[PDB]
Amino acid sequence: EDESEALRQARKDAELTASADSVRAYLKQIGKVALLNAEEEVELAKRIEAGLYATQLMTELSERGEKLPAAQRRDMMWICRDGDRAKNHLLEANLRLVVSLAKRYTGRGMAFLDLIQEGNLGLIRAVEKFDYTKGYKFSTYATWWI
Amino acid sequence: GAMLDVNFFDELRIGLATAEDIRQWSYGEVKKPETINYRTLKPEKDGLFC
Amino acid sequence: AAPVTHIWYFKGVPSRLGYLLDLAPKDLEKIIYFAAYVITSVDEEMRHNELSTLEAEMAVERKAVEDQRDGELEARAQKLEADLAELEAEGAKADARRKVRDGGEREMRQIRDRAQRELDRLEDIWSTFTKLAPKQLIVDENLYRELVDRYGEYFTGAMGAESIQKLIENFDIDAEAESLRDVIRNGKGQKKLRAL
Amino acid sequence: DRVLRGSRLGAVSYETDRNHDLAPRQIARYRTDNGEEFEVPFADDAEIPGTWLCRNGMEGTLIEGDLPEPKKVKPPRTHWDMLLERRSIEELEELLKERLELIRSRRRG
Amino acid sequence: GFSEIMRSTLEKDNTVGTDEALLDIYRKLRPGEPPTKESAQTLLENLFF
Amino acid sequence: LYRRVINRNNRLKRLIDLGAPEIIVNNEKRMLQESVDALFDNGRRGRPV
Numbered sequence: 001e002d003e004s005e006a007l008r009q010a011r012k013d014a015e016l017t018a019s020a021d022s023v024r025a026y027l028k029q030i031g032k033v034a035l036l037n038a039e040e041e042v043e044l045a046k047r048i049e050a051g052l053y054a055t056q057l058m059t060e061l062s063e064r065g066e067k068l069p070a071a072q073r074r075d076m077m078w079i080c081r082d083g084d085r086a087k088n089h090l091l092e093a094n095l096r097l098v099v100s101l102a103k104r105y106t107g108r109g110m111a112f113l114d115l116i117q118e119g120n121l122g123l124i125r126a127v128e129k130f131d132y133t134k135g136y137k138f139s140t141y142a143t144w145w146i
Numbered sequence: 147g148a149m150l151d152v153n154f155f156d157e158l159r160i161g162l163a164t165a166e167d168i169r170q171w172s173y174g175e176v177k178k179p180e181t182i183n184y185r186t187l188k189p190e191k192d193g194l195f196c
Numbered sequence: 197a198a199p200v201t202h203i204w205y206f207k208g209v210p211s212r213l214g215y216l217l218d219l220a221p222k223d224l225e226k227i228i229y230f231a232a233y234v235i236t237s238v239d240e241e242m243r244h245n246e247l248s249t250l251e252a253e254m255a256v257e258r259k260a261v262e263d264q265r266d267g268e269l270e271a272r273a274q275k276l277e278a279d280l281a282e283l284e285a286e287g288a289k290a291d292a293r294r295k296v297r298d299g300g301e302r303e304m305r306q307i308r309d310r311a312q313r314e315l316d317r318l319e320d321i322w323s324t325f326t327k328l329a330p331k332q333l334i335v336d337e338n339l340y341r342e343l344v345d346r347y348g349e350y351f352t353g354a355m356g357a358e359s360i361q362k363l364i365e366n367f368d369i370d371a372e373a374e375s376l377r378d379v380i381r382n383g384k385g386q387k388k389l390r391a392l
Numbered sequence: 393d394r395v396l397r398g399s400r401l402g403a404v405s406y407e408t409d410r411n412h413d414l415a416p417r418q419i420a421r422y423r424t425d426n427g428e429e430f431e432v433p434f435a436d437d438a439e440i441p442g443t444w445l446c447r448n449g450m451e452g453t454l455i456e457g458d459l460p461e462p463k464k465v466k467p468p469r470t471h472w473d474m475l476l477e478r479r480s481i482e483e484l485e486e487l488l489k490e491r492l493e494l495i496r497s498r499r500r501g
Numbered sequence: 502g503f504s505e506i507m508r509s510t511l512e513k514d515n516t517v518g519t520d521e522a523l524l525d526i527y528r529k530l531r532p533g534e535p536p537t538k539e540s541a542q543t544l545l546e547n548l549f550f
Numbered sequence: 551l552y553r554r555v556i557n558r559n560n561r562l563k564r565l566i567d568l569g570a571p572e573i574i575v576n577n578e579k580r581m582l583q584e585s586v587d588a589l590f591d592n593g594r595r596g597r598p599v
Contacts, residue, residue, distance in 0.1 A: 022580060
């Protein structure tokens, strides 16, 4: 049927399998996080830029700076952590786009997984250089770099 | 024991080689996936043929 | 840039790493190929006293769980009386005026089903933290991440050839061989053949 | 459509293998960072370089106290630099104050 | 009906239900993929028909 | 085989120095491990290269 944990136990026990092929292992790995929309990309980009400016400001005020108030230093570290959390979240969101693009350059010379890894490195560069105020979607910019 | 192989041997000991032996055998660390310059056919610097 | 296991001592007809560390080859392929975490070290005395303090923490958390459970029960009773007021005061079918009653009953049943499932989750992670030991594999990534971000002390655990290198680091051949000599001295049957 | 005749890319000469005299040569002692010593026999009239790429695989310096100070290049590109090339300090400070007010409203409201 | 072998297997079947057979087929033939009631509906009809 | 090991080692070093999430670095390390295993004995574990 659809309940009574028979199908649920079957899906759970089939989730914890070997999958000796490394490509199938990586695909089952990356099919995990939830995909995003343009509003989520806007939110994550704003959080990333805020965290980057906060950690650069803390880098400035670390040497020759100030013993800051405890709340100011604490939420400065909070924004500094939140920026990297958003960056990891964005990269892990668009891994699937890297896979879907790199499925077509196979069959000649290189192996599949090396193409996937080079696409991931291009996606790192695209999420570093992406801008949100130009009002475009993230795949529109990221396809160039990938 | 011997390393110039003067054909005076009495043993041949095998052994499980550690990283301290591996980086003691080697003469230089290869760090580039290149073999030969495509135009002048010379062995590349820091390649597999350096 | 990261250590790598030699293939002759991992995949043989006896697997020599498996016989040395007493691991199953099915488990060894899960460890050294980034399929499953492995507990490489653990504490004893910190676990011994935070056993009491963290079981107090666990009882506090499960008390809050049951508080949210009977709060869901009270909200179900409130919505059930609302269904009573909007059913048994007008003209309707006697089965259709209890259809919302049965829907709220099955809603309470699935709500306590969810609550009992996360109760099982908390009981599982607490029991696993009590029975934590070295050379133990942890499949189900979510359980390991929950265990780590709750109990980042008391143990370390990695995944791969670095973790295998840590296991070979924390290792004595003398007491292991003496235990095996004791087992082939006194034991019997299958365990004697395995110990040989 | 020919004969398989191979040749390695290199010539083989044969001259007199005499060891009774050679060119005179020095020996320079190079040192890496991790307590390693290396000997590289250069010739006598040879401008000995202050650094050297060692046999171990890391850039070792020369054990004589030359102190060359080669003045290495900048780190190429940062995420902060790619942010700063398209934003300004007051706009980044404005978003910083925005996130500060948001974490304040989440913390105590 | 006549086959002693077939009635012995139909008593030793230990599974009742078409979907109950389909989930076993999918979990043994697939394994490493979560089953759903449209995939086993299409997997067998893709393999032999 | 030597070029595959050299490529994946350089890429792993660049990913570690760049700062990448755990998924990419773990997949890269299992890629390097599979490449060295294929160097020492191709066709031992899984599909031969």
